[PDB]
Design a protein around this ligand. Structure first.
Ligand SMILES: NC(=O)C1=CN([C@@H]2O[C@H](COP(=O)(O)OP(=O)(O)OC[C@H]3O[C@@H](n4cnc5c(N)ncnc54)[C@H](O)[C@@H]3O)[C@@H](O)[C@H]2O)C=CC1
Ligand SMILES: Cc1cc2nc3c(=O)[nH]c(=O)nc-3n(C[C@H](O)[C@H](O)[C@H](O)COP(=O)(O)O)c2cc1C
Ligand code: SF4
Ligand code: SF4
Ligand code: SF4
Ligand code: FES
Ligand code: FES
Lengths: 139, 442, 226, 73, 156, 227
């Protein structure tokens, strides 16, 4: 299998842990070529999903990235939630030597995301950059 | 056998053929049991009865495809408002190695006239067109004289034998193209257009020449049917113990002791024809290859010479019967040059309609010229194999290209070593720019 | 009130698809910083289009799956030809997606008009007068088309058509000049023979230089050989 | 991106002028009198268009035009 | 300045009578013009289009599609040697070299007397009779290279 | 009617063509000889897909999307191995004798042959022999003629004769030396000869008025206007 293949990464044990914790529903796994498992988490579950990832036996300890995206002009959105905007969090676990991506969908009327600096303190500048470059507000 | 005896019971086609190679005119034709089948058809048989008679008699088409002509005559529309039906005789044959219709057109024209009469009454077609070629000229003169004699003697005109069936026959001499032999391209050429073929499943039996129901049948196909309606049906099924009923004008051609044309029943092995009727190879030739049908079918070795000359028997041998006129290739002739000539004919004689034939047969010609001159490059035999796989049935608009690339397929499959020996110099498609580093890959 | 439907052909200038305007030019619009450099190296500001829904730069929208009816140009990724219009339609070869530009503005009346009783009489030719018949060439009967320099090789030479019987009566052969007077101006045009024309008529190409389109149906006098 | 090797980037760097308007180099400030980093290449010897000094079928790997009315099949 | 003769026009109309369309008689009209004048000139296309009714583009396409409709001036006699496979096995290259040596021309070219025009042919349909070549509606079979000047010198 | 493309269900019309049904769904099938306003022929063989008989089938058969009806229950595949490599072979055959004059061509970024050569993913060349050329014609003040660019998909003659009713354009020649044009040199007297500029997928029939003062498609500032 080529390394550039569009993989869904449901064989990742972190996906199984998320299915055991928050149920088989309430998050949508996206098959990308990023090489990492990408899960669409709902907005109100984001803090507890991050808290669960921070308390794994080999937890995801570093917030690698945190930024927004404008989904308004994206035509090819198959297997994705109805999003006007999105905020993606890229998290790295070194002990697992893996990484996960957490995408939160947003509408035009309510561009409000719960803050992530109470879990990862490096999220301050990333959320400031998301509020600067996009219209996404962090509560 | 060393002496050939032709009787009407075993040779329905050429038993009345003259030994001095002279045409059999109307008086000699009717003397040797002429127009009896036309009489029975036009007096005592309904057209649907004749169509069902030909259908259960198993007159498969002798053009080269082997489709049953009863099915072709039964797919005419049942609407009585369509009374402008047409009958067409594919007298144009431009396939190399095929000369079967020249004999029946030069020295037995009234047999073709009677067959067209019977088929036209069976199909209720008021006009018949013998689509000839520009090279069959003595055949054209004989056909026109036979038509004149028939329309003088009360046949081929109006109120034929008091029946009230009006049928009239024309001879349309073509201006010369190999594609014109295909039935839809025959229709387009008869309409005086460029002879590009048409697309099925709109068939000529439902919408052909000028939008009217027509059918196109070979000279042999139209020439077997007077024997069927003059001698019998079960007689026609009982002249050969094979599921390919009837007799076919078989014969070998190409550097044999006696090249010719003999009417034989189906199921006769090609080795029998070659070693008995054709006389075998001459003194010094080893018979390294042969084709069942001339130039359209694919080559077979000595092991396939023992198979009976049937449609299905040669079908399972990775081949097809075709026109059943065998083509013999000896050991002294390079397969590369022979397939080069085949591809040159198919490239320059194709029509200009669809892409793969148009732009793959000249590429095969150029590759085979490079193999001839010893200028072959690595990647040419694989190119030819890919070309053969991509020029098969369904990939092109008509069946010219599969019959073109079957000899290439058999030449690659059997005589591969000469094609490998045609490659001597290494691959070089690009040349230097002297300022740009080339993308040399390993 | 009868022109009230013209605010339905296109939306206002404050119409945006997802907040942005629609681009007049493709995204690969080349040479922006050297286009005006021969007269000013300082790049000027882009022209502001306050009248309509379009921006003069490429910073707009020409997506095929965009809720609009008016498309400046058809371009799709992988479809750079004029065959990119099939991406802009719901079904190809049919109507454009999200409707069509322009509204009908007309509704069929419930009842029709009356039978027009005014039936004209036959055209009787009269001596000394000629009825002018329009011809209306495609490349020469439009006021804005003749000014195009490429049409001037396509329009026919200024001519005048005559019947064979009328030319025999005048004694003029085809290709030679004839003179006719209209508005007190005697002008000379070369004749040509029209087989399908009728007697007592003369044919002219309207819209050309010196030949007005309103000359159709008018009379003509003094058809004399020049 | 030049398919004719017409635009080239010399090893000369001694530029810098007094006015920015004079930094816009026109055609007469760019076209040099010889072939540069790609000396022997000529694009029109590959193109199939009718050219002054190059009739149809005179380019590289290109055959002479067979007439539509020609007698050969 | 092409002009159809009376016999040509009567033949074209008589062939028009045999079909449902004059377009079907286009090919035979081109053959009549070719038989009468050796080849089909440029004005003959417009003449056929005028007598028939079909456009001249169709007539030109028919004339340039079929091989034996000559749109170039040919010689008084057209030699047509078989280019196919059975005549290749029996040997057509020897008789082609003999024709090229006797006439000092190439295939597709005509002699400087305007007498012979050498051309290949798809297939003569007489494969069982050795090498084949047709000159002026006369076929010739069982050919040898040494019999070529004898067979060529009996023509005008 | 419903169809199955690449094992995916689609609801298309049953009375229309399969190529136009697939193109209406946003799927990409290359095509040359088909036009939405001119019907469908087999002058190219570019729209080839692999059709199966039932749901469980492996071999298939290469059919034409523009000549197969989009009936209920068809199972076609567009981007399998065989159809993709066959379409690559067809663009290779069309581009076997094609002049190396794209930058000096009038089409450039407007050319359909470029898009369908890139779409089939054919970049490497293994044809090392000679090309094919034709003489050009003077078609009048509006249509420039460059017959060497032609791929013989017969769309121009079909439009000009069947659709436009013109009596100037036509097909001449034979197998490979095929020609598309007028029998002589002269102006196309039909009033719709300008549509041949965009009907032709190649640079044969081009705009002479745009040949003078020429720029590429991406350099054009467009607007929707009324004539
Ligand atoms: N000189 C000659 O005799 C030559 C003969 N051939 C032969 O021609 C054959 C290929 O000819 P094609 O017509 O392309 O092949 P084909 O097998 O598709 O058609 C042959 C006949 O069957 C009829 N037919 C088949 N299926 C039919 C259906 N469902 N409904 C109605 N009619 C149907 C057609 O109308 C036609 O008359 C090859 O077998 C080849 O050997 C080829 C070249 C030259
Ligand atoms: C390219 C091509 C050329 C053909 N040439 C001939 C031909 O020359 N003579 C012939 O009888 N059939 C020829 N055929 C076969 C016809 O399509 C058709 O099968 C035949 O005319 C009548 O069929 P039948 O055998 O039922 O009578 C050709 C087919 C193709 C595809
Ligand atoms: S395969 Fe195509 S190009 Fe070749 S003869 Fe048939 S229709 Fe014509
Ligand atoms: S000139 Fe253009 S439209 Fe006509 S067949 Fe050639 S590529 Fe097609
Ligand atoms: S028409 Fe031919 S030469 Fe012109 S851009 Fe297209 S592929 Fe290139
Ligand atoms: S192969 Fe020459 S006559 Fe047939
Ligand atoms: S688009 Fe279907 S074969 Fe040409």
């Amino acid at each position: 299998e080529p390394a550039w293949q569009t993989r869904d990464h449901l064989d990742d044990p972190v996906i199984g842990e998320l299915r055991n914790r928050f149920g088989p529903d309430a998050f949508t796994v996206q098959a990308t070529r990023t090489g990492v498992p990408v899960v669409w988490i709902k907005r109100e579950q984001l803090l507890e999903v991050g808290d669960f990832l921070k308390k794994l036996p080999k937890p995801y300890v570093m917030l690698f990235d945190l930024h927004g995206m404008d989904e308004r002009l994206r035509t090819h959105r198959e297997g994705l939630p109805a999003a006007d905007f999105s905020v993606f969090y890229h998290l790295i676990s070194i002990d697992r030597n893996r990484d996960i991506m957490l995408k939160v969908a947003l509408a035009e009327n309510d561009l409000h995301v719960p803050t992530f600096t109470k879990l990862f303190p490096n999220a301050n500048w990333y959320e400031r950059e998301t509020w600067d470059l996009f219209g996404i507000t962090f509560d | 056998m060393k002496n050939i005896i032709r009787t009407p019971e075993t040779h329905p086609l050429t038993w009345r053929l003259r030994d001095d190679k002279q045409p059999v005119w109307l008086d000699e034709y009717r003397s040797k049991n002429g127009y009896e089948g036309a009489r029975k058809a036009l007096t005592g048989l309904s057209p649907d009865e004749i169509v069902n008679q030909v259908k259960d008699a198993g007159l498969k088409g002798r053009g080269g495809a082997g489709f049953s002509t009863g099915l072709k005559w039964s797919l005419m529309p049942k609407d009585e408002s369509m009374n402008i039906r047409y009958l067409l005789c594919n007298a144009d044959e431009m396939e190399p190695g095929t000369y079967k219709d020249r004999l029946l057109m030069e020295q037995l024209p009234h047999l073709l006239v009677e067959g067209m009469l019977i088929s036209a009454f069976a199909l209720k077609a008021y006009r018949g067109y013998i689509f000839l070629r520009g090279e069959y000229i003595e055949a054209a003169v004989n056909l026109r004289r036979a038509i004149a004699e028939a329309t003088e003697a009360g046949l081929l005109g109006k109120n034929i034998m008091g029946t009230g069936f009006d049928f009239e026959l024309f001879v349309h001499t073509g201006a010369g193209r190999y594609i014109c032999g295909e039935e839809t391209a025959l229709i387009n050429s008869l309409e005086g257009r460029r002879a590009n073929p048409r697309s099925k499943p709109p068939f000529p039996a439902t919408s052909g020449a000028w939008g009217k129901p027509t059918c196109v049948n070979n000279v042999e196909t139209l020439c077997n049917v007077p024997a069927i309606l003059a001698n019998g049906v079960e007689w026609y099924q009982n002249i050969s113990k094979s599921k390919d009923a009837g007799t076919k004008l078989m014969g070998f051609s190409g550097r044999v002791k006696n090249p010719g044309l003999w009417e034989l029943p189906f199921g006769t092995t090609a080795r029998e024809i070659l070693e008995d009727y054709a006389g075998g190879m001459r003194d010094g030739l080893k018979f390294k290859a042969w084709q069942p049908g001339g130039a359209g079918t694919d080559f077979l070795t000595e092991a396939h010479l023992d198979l009976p000359m049937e449609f299905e028997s040669i079908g399972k041998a990775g081949s097809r019967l075709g026109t059943a006129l065998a083509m013999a290739v000896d050991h002294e002739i390079n397969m590369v040059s022979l397939v080069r000539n085949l591809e040159e004919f198919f490239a320059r004689e194709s029509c200009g309609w669809c892409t793969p034939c148009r732009d793959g047969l000249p590429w095969s010609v150029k590759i085979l010229r490079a193999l001839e001159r010893g200028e072959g490059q690595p990647g040419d035999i694989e190119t030819l194999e890919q070309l053969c796989r991509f020029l098969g049935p369904g990939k092109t608009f008509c069946a010219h290209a599969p019959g073109a690339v079957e000899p290439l397929q058999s030449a690659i499959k059997y005589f591969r070593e000469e094609f490998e020996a045609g490659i001597k110099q290494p691959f070089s498609n690009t040349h230097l720019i002297n300022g740009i580093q080339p993308n040399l890959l390993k | 009130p009868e022109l009230a439907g013209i605010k339905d052909a296109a939306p206002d200038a404050t119409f945006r698809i997802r907040g942005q305007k629609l681009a007049r030019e493709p995204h690969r619009y080349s040479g922006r910083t050297a286009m005006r450099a021969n007269i000013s190296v300082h790049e000027p500001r882009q022209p502001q289009d306050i009248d309509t829904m379009f921006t003069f730069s490429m910073e707009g929208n020409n997506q095929p799956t965009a809720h609009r009816s008016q498309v400046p140009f058809a371009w799709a990724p992988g479809w750079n030809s004029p065959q990119a219009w099939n991406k802009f339609q719901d079904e190809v070869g049919g109507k454009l997606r999200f409707g069509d530009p322009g509204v009908r503005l007309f509704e069929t009346s419930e009842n029709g008009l009356d039978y027009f009783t005014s039936v004209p009489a036959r055209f009787q030719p009269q001596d000394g007068k000629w009825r002018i018949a329009p011809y209306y060439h495609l490349f020469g009967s439009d006021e804005l088309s003749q000014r195009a320099p490429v049409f001037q090789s396509r329009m026919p030479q200024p001519y005048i058509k005559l019947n064979p019987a009328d030319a025999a009566k005048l004694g003029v052969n085809a290709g030679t000049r004839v003179s006719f007077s209209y508005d007190g101006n005697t002008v000379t045009l070369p004749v040509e023979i029209a087989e399908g024309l009728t007697a007592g008529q003369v044919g002219l190409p309207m819209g050309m230089s010196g030949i007005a389109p309103v000359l159709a149906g008018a009379h003509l006098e003094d058809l004399k050989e020049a | 991106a030049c398919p004719t090797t017409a635009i080239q980037l010399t090893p000369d760097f001694e530029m810098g002028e007094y006015k920015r308007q004079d930094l816009v180099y026109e055609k007469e400030d760019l076209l040099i009198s010889g072939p540069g980093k790609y000396p022997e290449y000529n694009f029109y010897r590959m193109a199939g268009m009718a050219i002054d000094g190059k009739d149809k079928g005179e380019a590289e790997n290109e055959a002479k035009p067979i007439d539509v009315k020609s007698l050969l099949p | 300045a092409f002009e159809l003769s009376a016999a040509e026009r009567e033949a074209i109309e008589h062939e028009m009578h045999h079909y449902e369309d004059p377009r079907a008689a286009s090919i035979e009209a081109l053959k009549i013009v070719q038989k009468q004048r050796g080849w089909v000139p440029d004005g003959a296309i417009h003449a056929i289009a005028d007598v028939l009714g079909i456009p001249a583009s169709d007539v030109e396409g028919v004339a340039t599609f079929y091989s034996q409709i000559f749109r170039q001036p040919v010689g008084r006699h057209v030699i047509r040697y078989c280019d196919s496979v059975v005549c290749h096995i029996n040997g057509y290259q020897g008789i082609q070299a003999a024709l090229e040596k006797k006439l000092n021309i190439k295939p597709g070219q005509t002699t400087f007397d305007g007498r012979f025009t050498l051309l290949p042919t798809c297939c003569l349909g007489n494969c069982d009779k050795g090498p084949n070549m047709m000159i002026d509606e006369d076929t010739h079979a069982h050919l040898t290279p040494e019999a070529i000047p004898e067979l060529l010198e009996r023509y005008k | 009617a419903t169809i199955h493309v690449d094992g995916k269900e689609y609801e298309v019309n049953g009375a229309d063509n399969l190529l136009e049904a697939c193109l209406s769904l946003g799927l990409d099938i290359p095509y040359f000889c088909w036009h939405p306003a001119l019907g469908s022929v087999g002058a190219c063989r570019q729209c080839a897909v692999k059709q199966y008989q039932n749901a469980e089938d492996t071999r298939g058969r290469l059919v034409m999307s523009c000549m197969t009806p989009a009936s209920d229950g068809t199972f076609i595949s567009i981007d399998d191995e065989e159809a993709k490599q066959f379409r690559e072979s067809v663009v290779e055959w069309l581009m076997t004798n094609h002049p190396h004059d794209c930058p000096v061509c009038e089409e450039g970024g407007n050319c359909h042959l470029q898009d369908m050569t890139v779409m089939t993913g054919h970049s490497f060349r293994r044809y090392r022999f000679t090309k094919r050329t034709h003489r050009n014609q003077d078609l009048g003040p509006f249509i420039s003629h460059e017959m060497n660019r032609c791929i013989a998909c017969y769309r121009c003659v079909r439009y000009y004769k069947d659709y436009a009713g013109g009596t100037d354009l036509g097909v001449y020649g034979a197998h490979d030396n095929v020609y598309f044009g007028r029998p002589e040199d002269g102006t196309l007297e039909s009033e719709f000869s300008g549509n041949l500029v965009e009907i032709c997928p190649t640079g044969v029939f081009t705009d002479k008025t745009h040949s003078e003062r020429y720029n590429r498609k991406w350099d054009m500032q467009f607007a929707p206007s009324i004539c």
